[PDB]
Amino acid sequence: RRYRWRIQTAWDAGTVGYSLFQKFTERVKELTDGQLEVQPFPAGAVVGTFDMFDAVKTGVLDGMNPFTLYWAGRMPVTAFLSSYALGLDRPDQWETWFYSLGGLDIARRAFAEQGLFYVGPVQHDLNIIHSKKPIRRFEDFKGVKLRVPGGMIAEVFAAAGASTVLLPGGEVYPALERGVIDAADFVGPAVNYNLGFHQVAKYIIMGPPETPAIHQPVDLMDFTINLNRWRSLPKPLQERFIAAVHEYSWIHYAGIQKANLEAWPKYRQAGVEVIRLSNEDVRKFRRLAIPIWFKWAKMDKYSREAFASQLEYMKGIGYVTDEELKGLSL
Amino acid sequence: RRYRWRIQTAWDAGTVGYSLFQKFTERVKELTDGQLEVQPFPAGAVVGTFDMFDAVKTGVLDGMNPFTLYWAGRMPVTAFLSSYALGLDRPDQWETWFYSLGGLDIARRAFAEQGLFYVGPVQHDLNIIHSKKPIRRFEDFKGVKLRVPGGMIAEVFAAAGASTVLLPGGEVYPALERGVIDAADFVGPAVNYNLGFHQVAKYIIMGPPETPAIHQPVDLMDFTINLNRWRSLPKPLQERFIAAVHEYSWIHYAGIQKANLEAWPKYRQAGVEVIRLSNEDVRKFRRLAIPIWFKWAKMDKYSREAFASQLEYMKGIGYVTDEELKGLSL
Ligand SMILES: [Ca+2]
Numbered sequence: 004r005r006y007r008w009r010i011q012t013a014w015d016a017g018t019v020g021y022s023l024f025q026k027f028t029e030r031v032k033e034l035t036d037g038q039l040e041v042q043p044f045p046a047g048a049v050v051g052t053f054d055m056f057d058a059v060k061t062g063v064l065d066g067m068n069p070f071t072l073y074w075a076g077r078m079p080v081t082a083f084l085s086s087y088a089l090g091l092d093r094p095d096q097w098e099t100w101f102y103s104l105g106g107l108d109i110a111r112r113a114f115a116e117q118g119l120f121y122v123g124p125v126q127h128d129l130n131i132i133h134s135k136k137p138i139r140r141f142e143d144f145k146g147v148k149l150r151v152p153g154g155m156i157a158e159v160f161a162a163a164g165a166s167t168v169l170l171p172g173g174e175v176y177p178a179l180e181r182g183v184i185d186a187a188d189f190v191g192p193a194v195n196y197n198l199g200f201h202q203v204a205k206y207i208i209m210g211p212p213e214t215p216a217i218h219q220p221v222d223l224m225d226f227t228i229n230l231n232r233w234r235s236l237p238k239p240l241q242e243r244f245i246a247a248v249h250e251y252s253w254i255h256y257a258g259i260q261k262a263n264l265e266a267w268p269k270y271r272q273a274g275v276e277v278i279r280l281s282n283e284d285v286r287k288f289r290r291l292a293i294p295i296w297f298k299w300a301k302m303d304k305y306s307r308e309a310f311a312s313q314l315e316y317m318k319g320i321g322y323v324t325d326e327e328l329k330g331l332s333l
Numbered sequence: 334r335r336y337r338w339r340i341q342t343a344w345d346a347g348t349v350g351y352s353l354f355q356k357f358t359e360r361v362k363e364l365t366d367g368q369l370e371v372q373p374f375p376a377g378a379v380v381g382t383f384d385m386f387d388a389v390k391t392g393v394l395d396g397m398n399p400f401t402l403y404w405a406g407r408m409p410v411t412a413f414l415s416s417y418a419l420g421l422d423r424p425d426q427w428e429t430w431f432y433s434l435g436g437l438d439i440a441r442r443a444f445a446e447q448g449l450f451y452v453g454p455v456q457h458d459l460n461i462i463h464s465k466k467p468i469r470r471f472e473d474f475k476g477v478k479l480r481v482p483g484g485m486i487a488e489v490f491a492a493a494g495a496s497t498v499l500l501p502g503g504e505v506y507p508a509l510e511r512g513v514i515d516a517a518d519f520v521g522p523a524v525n526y527n528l529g530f531h532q533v534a535k536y537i538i539m540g541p542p543e544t545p546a547i548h549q550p551v552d553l554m555d556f557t558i559n560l561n562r563w564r565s566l567p568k569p570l571q572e573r574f575i576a577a578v579h580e581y582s583w584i585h586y587a588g589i590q591k592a593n594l595e596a597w598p599k600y601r602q603a604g605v606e607v608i609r610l611s612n613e614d615v616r617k618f619r620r621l622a623i624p625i626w627f628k629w630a631k632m633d634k635y636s637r638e639a640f641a642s643q644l645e646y647m648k649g650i651g652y653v654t655d656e657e658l659k660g661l662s663l
């Protein structure tokens with residue numbers, strides 16, 4: 004018997020990300036000798052991006068390739084299954100945490116309670132911010148209407164005085180064009196260019212060279228499958244799909260990074276100015292961020308479990324000092 | 334039809350690396366439903382580590398899991414298929430170069446001329462140095478007899494005044510114990526501890542926090558198969574083995590990194606002092622390293638091709654300035 008799964012991605016059609024996702028479906032067919040095929044759908048083709056969770060839960064979709072933290076408002080732990088401000092900031096650190104420090108099992112247990120099978124994380128990129136007006140220091144965030152992906156990311160910017168809004172990446176261009184928002188984070192340079200941000204915002208705001216991505220340094224995607232659908236798939240094919248997703252994680256990461264190298268010169272040609280914040284701006288954000296990490300960790304049992312092991316790992320690699328954790332504990 | 338390959342690894346028996354490699358063989362069996370099985374062999378079990386290349390080329394071994402740059406003396410390009418001093422220094426950069434910037438095909442073409450199939454790189458770790466006496470500054474390397482893995486790694490230390498020796502990792506302990514050498518680089522902290530270096534050298538020499546690994550920040554392994562054995566394998570299984578190796582690359586990396594976290598406290602208990610060199614020391618090594626990149630790059634068509642794309646990538650991410658390239662060329 005052969006299996007066919009409908010899977011929608013958070014990537015919009017006409018982006019480098021969707022092209023990579025389409026190629027993944029061909030790779031899955033190849034690795035399973037046609038026994039398991041994935042029918043790809045670009046963002047919004049079946050349901051809205053933020054509605055994918057419920058669509059997969061019910062079976063309208065068989066699976067999804069979202070940015071994991073989109074479920075932060077309903078599953079606290081998902082804010083810890085993708086990067087948060089000023090924490091672990093390299094792809095390899097998130098890979099180690101998931102694959103040898105216990106992160107994958109925490110994600111699987113949390114998603115199983117929701118009737119979903121979390122396959123694994125998909126590496127991707129850091130994220131940048133586009134702004135219509137210059138934001139040159141920490142204090143310039145006050146009063147900025149900023150699109151962000153909710154959760155802990157939005158909470159940190161709200162603590163910096165911004166008015167945050169949640170919108171799918173495909174709605175950012177018209178929101179900026181119409182002046183509904185002043186600035187927007189979405190993903191890295193290449194996809195944001197595919198979406199036209201350079202024509203509706205003349206600035207890019209990044210951290211200093213020492214900390215280029217303050218809010219989302221490792222913006223992970225994942226594959227999450229309807230649990231019944233997953234359990235119905237023969238084990239040999241389940242294992243081949245897990246391996247296919249892990250291989251794709253890095254093929255996707257590499258494809259996005261190649262496109263990003265090609266994108267920076269295009270921003271220069273479009274007259275977009277890249278503004279770099281300072282090391283002191285980062286210290287200000289850090290004092291806002293750390294207590295917010297603990298607030299989120301304290302929401303439920305899974306968020307606490309995930310943050311506890313990430314905090315131990317950060318201490319082990321010198322990312323956090325005991326002094327800056329004064330008054331904060333699990 | 335079932336296929337069985339004997340593959341020897343550069344990892345010695347009794348190390349975390351070898352344990353990870355044994356688990357990989359089980360994973361391969363699982364992913365191929367038993368159609369392709371790998372019989373693992375630890376370092377030296379069938380042939381000496383540096384003799385694996387000829388063993389695989391001639392069919393004595395079906396494949397190998399070496400540190401790729403061990404072939405630098407016979408294949409110049411292999412010095413560019415693993416990290417070299419002060420160049421690309423993050424796992425993700427090497428992953429991008431191989432998987433989207435053309436590196437994998439350069440490696441495959443170069444190895445095919447040798448009658449070998451280069452499957453793909455296996456992520457691993459940065460490397461540290463163990464010394465019997467303190468080495469606290471750049472100038473302290475002069476006169477030190479140091480074990481290193483040849484190629485560009487040895488050339489950079491030779492340029493700093495050290496006398497270099499090539500020895501397999503399994504001979505480093507007796508070389509230090511008997512005073513044949515003064516210091517040795519091998520791999521990361523956990524495996525070097527498995528091999529007992531803390532008993533025979535009471536110092537670890539590392540770069541500053543800003544540049545912890547000056548010489549080998551991304552010490553890649555790989556899987557290389559006898560070309561005829563490879564071509565004899567059905568395409569579906571070839572593709573499954575490629576996916577298995579790419580999944581393993583990161584499972585191996587994560588396993589090594591978890592072990593490393595556990596090893597540091599053991600060095601403290603063993604009375605080993607971790608010495609940190611300075612940013613100025615790194616600058617002194619950099620003045621020697623860059624010219625050596627160019628010296629090796631011009632050795633043949635493949636080294637030229639690989640370094641040319643790595644250099645363009647380094648320029649794109651700000652790893653090299655035009656000023657420091659003044660006076661250098663291929
Ligand atoms: Ca974002």
Ligand SMILES: [Ca+2]
Pocket residue numbers: 460482518519520549552
């Ligand atoms: Ca080494």
